[PDB]
């Protein structure tokens, strides 16, 4: 689990969005596994606007942060799950690092701010949904 709180927005994995997220929907994209809902309180986070390919992510299944080198956002095949049919997930960055299903929502940060959230993984990989291109989160 986990979310990004920026301005009056809450960014979550679309597959973990709550009834309240859907009732306050701003934007969602199944191909990216992202959903953004509106909030009444001002958020605590800021978003990176950069091309970093290294950073640190929070891994809830280890209660620890780990450093990673990750690929640039791209279209990657993701096998069927209980949440989605077999499809290509867009804006996805892969890295070598531990992850388990419940680790979705962990934040990836570089020195500039939040880069994205855990969205896929397994067998020693961890995949992050990028949010750096969503410029409207800042206004
Ligand atoms: C951190 S995810 C993970 C980690 C380890 C293992 Br084994 C397996 C997973 C994958 C997983 O649980 N899902 C369910 C959530 C949907 C997601 C998606 N973005 O389409 C991909 C599939
Ligand atoms: Zn950066």
UniProtKB/Swiss-Prot annotation:
Zn(2+) 1 binds at residues 50, 52, 110, 112. It comes from the Viruses. The active site is at 15 (for protease 2a activity), 33 (for protease 2a activity), 104 (for protease 2a activity). It catalyses: Selective cleavage of Tyr-|-Gly bond in the picornavirus polyprotein. Cysteine protease that cleaves viral polyprotein and specific host proteins. It is responsible for the autocatalytic cleavage between the P1 and P2 regions, which is the first cleavage occurring in the polyprotein. Also cleaves the host translation initiation factor EIF4G1, in order to shut down the capped cellular mRNA translation. Inhibits the host nucleus-cytoplasm protein and RNA trafficking by cleaving host members of the nuclear pores. Counteracts stress granule formation probably by antagonizing its assembly or promoting its dissassembly. Homodimer. This is Protease 2A. The lineage of its organism: Viruses, Riboviria, Orthornavirae, Pisuviricota, Pisoniviricetes.
